[PDB]
Design a protein around this ligand. Structure first.
Ligand SMILES: Cc1cc2nc3c(=O)[nH]c(=O)nc-3n(C[C@H](O)[C@H](O)[C@H](O)COP(=O)(O)OP(=O)(O)OC[C@H]3O[C@@H](n4cnc5c(N)ncnc54)[C@H](O)[C@@H]3O)c2cc1C
Length: 472
């Protein structure tokens, strides 16, 4: 296939007889363009003179990692667009709302030769893949199952053979093979027309209303549209695309929460796979000569950091718990477990932004009402939760709960890793020992005041919350 073999993990070789359909079980990478898993499926189909189908399984209530209206609405409106693009291309798109068990069911009805899955290190996804593999192993051992890393530039199992200590050590490994993997995408190979079972028609308006009303009412975001088309516009649009109109000031503005527009705004799209991270990297390379320092800094966050989070979650099964932190960090947090905290807030008080700290309150409200807290503020926000709760495990649990509830880009390896960086020093060095934090990196209000106009950020969030509360 068009996919580099290192991107392809053959889970089960299969056998039986070729000529059977190839099915791409789409999960993490909700796009037709720049998708190695789809390209691999199409390549298998084309080579065996067999038809090609895409299937998507929505996890039913309580939904994947407790997705709320906000996240469900974005995913489904994105999939509605994708389904339309699929039909225009005569690529069959099967939508299953009962759960992943429908995937093996379909594979058997169609007499599929191969199932291709994409890759995520998150435990509920890995467990669902494993269960599907087991179902097929027992009922259709002739069916081949392949998994393709379509999300990372460098395949997760190839980038490193182990969980890496930090961005530095991870960069050392990936920079060596970056030229081999940061390459263009070919077009989908042509495949014979689909002549098998036809996907059932979806009433998307009915489905979206149903699913979202079954989930907690965290409101949909209104400031960007989901899907491939809107994602490419966010990256490359002539009017206000990131790489076209905003890349220049990135290295010097990305840490300034009073410059909301300096960030790429790509994480919503990258999380749902509406846009390929490799696509974003390729386009950045094409404009590096115009803004070398900023592009280099962008590529560091986009490739090294993001992929380091996949590395961690893939190799560390306890990626959302204190036990998953490094020994130095666990010990320093334990050493300071008995230190009296200056403030203790409950989860409810934090969630509703009822602390003595107006900067922290602002960061919480930005997440609640806007759905995307400024990247610099996420570090401050999570560190205060450590400072104002009874212990690091409770802090970690609360940060993750809030992040996953409110962020449009949440329920993501990078969310778990962000909280772990903040609270447990994951991928960080140690610093001067102090009460509560021990050697975990400390940040404070005074430190923020030196760097940027804190009152301006506070005012900006107040205005956002106001509009959001009125709209609600
Ligand atoms: C406490 C905490 C929680 C976080 N929760 C999430 C989350 O739920 N989902 C999420 O995607 N990121 C999370 N992050 C990482 C980071 O804050 C966001 O990726 C970033 O703010 C996204 O906005 P952007 O796309 O405009 O960023 P940009 O600065 O434009 O970055 C571009 C891309 O680089 C990647 N990136 C940037 N910073 C990081 C990082 N520290 N770790 C991994 N990748 C990074 C992302 O893919 C991002 O889209 C968290 C960080 C912290 C400290």
């Amino acid at each position: 296939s068009p996919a580099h073999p290192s991107r392809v993990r053959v889970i089960h070789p299969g056998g039986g007889k070729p000529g059977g359909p190839v099915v791409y079980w789409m999960l993490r990478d909700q796009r037709l363009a720049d998708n190695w898993a789809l390209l691999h499926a199409a390549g298998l189909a084309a080579a065996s003179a067999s038809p090609l189908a895409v299937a998507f399984a929505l996890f039913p209530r309580p939904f994947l990692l407790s997705a709320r209206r906000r996240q469900l609405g974005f995913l489904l409106r994105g999939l509605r667009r994708l389904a339309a693009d699929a039909a225009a291309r005569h690529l069959p798109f099967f939508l299953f709302t009962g759960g992943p068990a429908e995937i093996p069911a379909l594979v058997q009805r169609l007499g599929a030769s191969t199932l291709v899955a994409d890759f995520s290190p998150l435990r509920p996804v890995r467990e669902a893949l494993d269960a599907v593999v087991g179902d097929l192993r027992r009922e259709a051992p002739g069916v081949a199952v392949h998994q393709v890393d379509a999300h990372n530039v460098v395949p997760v199992w190839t980038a490193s053979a182990k969980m890496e200590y930090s961005a530095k050590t991870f960069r050392g490994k990936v920079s060596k093979v970056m030229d081999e993997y940061l390459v263009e995408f070919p077009e989908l190979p042509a495949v014979v027309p689909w002549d098998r079972e036809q996907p059932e028609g979806v009433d998307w308006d009915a489905l979206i209303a149903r699913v979202c009303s079954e989930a907690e009412n965290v409101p949909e975001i209104d400031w960007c549209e989901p899907g491939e088309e809107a994602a490419i516009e966010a990256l490359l649009g002539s009017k206000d695309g990131f790489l076209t109109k905003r890349i220049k000031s990135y290295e010097t503005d990305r840490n300034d929460p009073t410059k909301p527009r300096a960030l790429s705004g790509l994480s919503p799209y990258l999380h749902f796979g509406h846009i390929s991270a490799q696509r974003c990297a390729l386009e950045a390379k094409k404009c590096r000569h115009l803004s070398p320092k900023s592009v280099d800094a962008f590529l560091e966050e986009l490739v090294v950091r993001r992929e380091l989070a996949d590395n961690f979650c893939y190799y560390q099964p306890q990626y959302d718990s204190l036990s998953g932190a490094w020994e130095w960090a666990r010990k320093t947090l334990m050493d300071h477990a008995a230190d009296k905290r200056e403030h203790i807030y409950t989860r409810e008080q934090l969630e509703n932004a009822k602390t003595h700290d107006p900067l922290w309150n602002a960061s919480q409200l930005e997440m609640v009402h806007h759905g995307k807290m400024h990247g610099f503020m996420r570090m401050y926000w999570a560190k205060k939760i450590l400072e104002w709760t009874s212990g690091p495990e409770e802090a970690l649990s609360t940060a993750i709960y809030l992040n996953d509830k409110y962020e449009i880009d949440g329920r993501d390896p990078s969310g778990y890793v962000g909280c772990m960086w903040s609270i447990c020093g994951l991928h960080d060095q140690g610093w001067k020992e102090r009460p509560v934090f021990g050697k975990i990196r400390y940040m404070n209000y005074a430190g923020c005041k030196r760097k940027f106009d804190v009152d301006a950020y506070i005012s900006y969030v107040k205005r956002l919350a106001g509009q959001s509360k009125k709209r609600n």
